[PDB]
C-alpha cells in the first residue's frame, strides 16, 4: 500500500501544459482520483476515475493504466490559479480507506505582459536600520538565487495583481543589517536582466 510521486516542485510558465503522475505496485488499487491542495488549506477533490480510461473536464485530463500501474493528470493552458500541490489518491474495493501520494507542488508563473526590470531602495519607516532592496517588474523567465552568505536574506519571486488596472508584476526582497550590504550588488548571485538603478 505505497504510491510513488515526484514532489517537484515543478515550475512552468502560464499557458504551459503540465503533467503530473503517480505510480504504484499493488494491483488491488481499483479507484483513482486527484486532489488539489492550496497552501495552508485542506485537500479538495479535483478529478476521479475507475479502471482504465481517460476522463476529460475542461482543461484537465485524468488517466489511469492498470497494466503499467500508472496514473496521470494533464493540465493544459496552465493558469496561475493552478499553483498548488496535487495528490493522487487511490484505494481498493475492500475499504473506503484512501492512500495518498506525497504530492507534487506546481508553480505556474504568471505571464507579465510589460516587464520593466529594476531594483530600488526602500527606507525604514519611523526609525529602523537595515537596508531593504526591492527587485521588481521583471519577467517570470527570471530566477532569484539565494545570497552566498546568511547575513543577506532573500525571498523568492512573488506576483502581485492590481485588478483595478489589469496589471500584475513580480518582486523579490533582500535585506541585511550588514554595513557593506547595498543595493546594486544585492542580487549579484542571480542572473538578472540588464536593468538596474541607483539614487
Amino acid at each position: 500500500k505505497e504510491v510513488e510521486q515526484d514532489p517537484g516542485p515543478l515550475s512552468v510558465p502560464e499557458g504551459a501544459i503540465v503533467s503530473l503522475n503517480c505510480t504504484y505496485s499493488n494491483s488491488a488499487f481499483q479507484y483513482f482520483m486527484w486532489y488539489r491542495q492550496y497552501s495552508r488549506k485542506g485537500p479538495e477533490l479535483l478529478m476521479y476515475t475507475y479502471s482504465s480510461g481517460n476522463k476529460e473536464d475542461g482543461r484537465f485530463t485524468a488517466q489511469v493504466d492498470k497494466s503499467s500501474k500508472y496514473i496521470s493528470l494533464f493540465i493544459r493552458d496552465s493558469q496561475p490559479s493552478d499553483s498548488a500541490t496535487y495528490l493522487c489518491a487511490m484505494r481498493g474495493d475492500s475499504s473506503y480507506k484512501l492512500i495518498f501520494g506525497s504530492g507534487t507542488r506546481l508553480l505556474v508563473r504568471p505571464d507579465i505582459q510589460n516587464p520593466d526590470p529594476a531594483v530600488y531602495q526602500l527606507r525604514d519607516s519611523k526609525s529602523s536600520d537595515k537596508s531593504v532592496c526591492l527587485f521588481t517588474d521583471f519577467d517570470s523567465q527570471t530566477n532569484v538565487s539565494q545570497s552566498k552568505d546568511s547575513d543577506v536574506y532573500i525571498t523568492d519571486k512573488c506576483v502581485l495583481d492590481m485588478r483595478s488596472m489589469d496589471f500584475k508584476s513580480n518582486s523579490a526582497v533582500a535585506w541585511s543589517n550588514k554595513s557593506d550590504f547595498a543595493c546594486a550588488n544585492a542580487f549579484n548571485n542571480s542572473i538578472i536582466p540588464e536593468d538596474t538603478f541607483f539614487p
Binding site: 488549506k41 485542506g42 484512501l98 506525497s102 530600488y120 529602523s128 531593504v132 502581485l160 539614487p199
Partner: protein
C-alpha cells in the same frame, strides 16, 4: 453549505501536555476520517469511523493516540502525552456511502499542531514597514510598500495589509513560506516578507493610512511561563505608515 469544521486551527504546546483536536463533520455524513500531514511522510490516514464505530485504526500510533465519536456530529482525537514528532497538520474529513464510491471526501481546514521541547524557544514576530522609493514613483506611476516580519518561532503566522482600517488583497503578495534566519541550527527563528503596491497618486494622498499586520500563534493562559520576558503569547504585532506627498 457548512463544510467540515475543525478546532482549534493552531496549537502550539510543550511536550508532555495533553492535546485535544476536535472535528465536526458535515450534517448527514456517517463516515468520518482523521489524517495527519508532514513533509517527510505526506498525507496519512490515522483512523476512520462509520456510524460512530471505528473501522480502521491501522495508521494510529500506539496508545499515546486516542480517538472517538461519542455521537454522530462530533469526533475527537487525543494525544496523551504529546511529543515533538507528533507535530503536523491534522485533518478531519467527512463523507457518505454513495460519495465514497465516487471517492469524495470533504476535508476541513485542518489543525496545525506544534509540540515543542520547551517553550523558551518561542518568540513572537518583530514587524517593520519599509516605505517606497522615490525612484519607483518617478520611474513609474506606482508605489510599492514592503512589510517584514522577523524573529518569530514557531512558523504559525498570518500577515495582512490594511488600507484605511480595511483589509486589502488587491496589490498584495506574501512569501508562500517563511525562511529560517539561521539554516545551520536544527531549529531556528523565521522571517516572512510581503509587499503592497498602490498607485503613486493613492500613496501621495496625505489621508490614506497603510498598516501591516501579522497574527502569531504562541502560548496561551494555562501555559506556564517562569521567565523574565514578555510571555510569547498568541497576539498581533504590527507596523504602519501614512500617505505623504513631497
Amino acid at each position: 453549505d457548512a463544510g467540515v469544521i475543525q478546532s482549534p486551527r493552531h496549537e502550539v504546546t510543550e511536550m508532555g501536555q495533553q492535546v485535544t483536536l476536535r472535528c465536526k463533520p458535515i450534517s448527514g455524513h456517517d463516515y468520518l476520517f482523521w489524517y495527519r500531514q508532514t513533509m517527510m511522510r505526506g498525507l496519512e490516514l490515522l483512523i476512520y469511523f462509520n456510524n460512530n464505530v471505528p473501522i480502521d485504526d491501522s495508521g494510529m500510533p500506539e496508545d499515546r493516540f486516542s480517538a472517538k465519536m461519542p455521537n454522530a456530529s462530533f469526533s475527537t482525537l487525543k494525544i496523551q502525552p504529546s511529543e515533538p514528532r507528533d507535530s503536523a497538520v491534522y485533518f478531519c474529513a467527512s463523507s457518505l456511502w454513495e460519495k465514497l464510491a465516487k471517492n469524495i471526501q470533504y476535508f476541513g481546514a485542518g489543525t496545525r499542531l506544534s509540540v515543542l521541547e520547551d517553550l523558551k524557544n518561542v518568540f513572537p514576530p518583530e514587524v517593520a514597514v519599509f516605505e517606497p522609493s522615490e525612484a519607483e514613483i518617478s520611474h513609474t506611476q506606482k508605489a510599492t510598500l514592503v512589510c517584514l516580519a522577523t524573529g518569530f518561532y514557531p512558523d504559525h503566522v498570518e500577515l495582512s495589509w490594511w488600507v484605511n482600517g480595511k483589509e486589502v488583497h488587491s496589490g498584495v503578495c506574501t512569501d508562500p513560506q517563511p525562511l529560517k534566519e539561521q539554516p545551520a541550527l536544527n531549529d531556528s527563528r523565521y522571517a516572512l516578507s510581503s509587499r503592497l503596491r498602490v498607485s503613486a497618486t493613492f500613496w501621495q494622498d496625505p489621508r490614506n493610512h497603510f498598516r501591516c499586520q501579522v497574527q502569531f500563534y504562541g502560548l496561551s493562559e494555562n501555559d506556564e511561563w517562569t521567565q523574565d520576558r514578555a510571555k510569547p503569547v498568541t497576539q498581533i504585532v504590527s507596523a504602519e505608515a501614512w500617505g505623504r506627498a513631497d
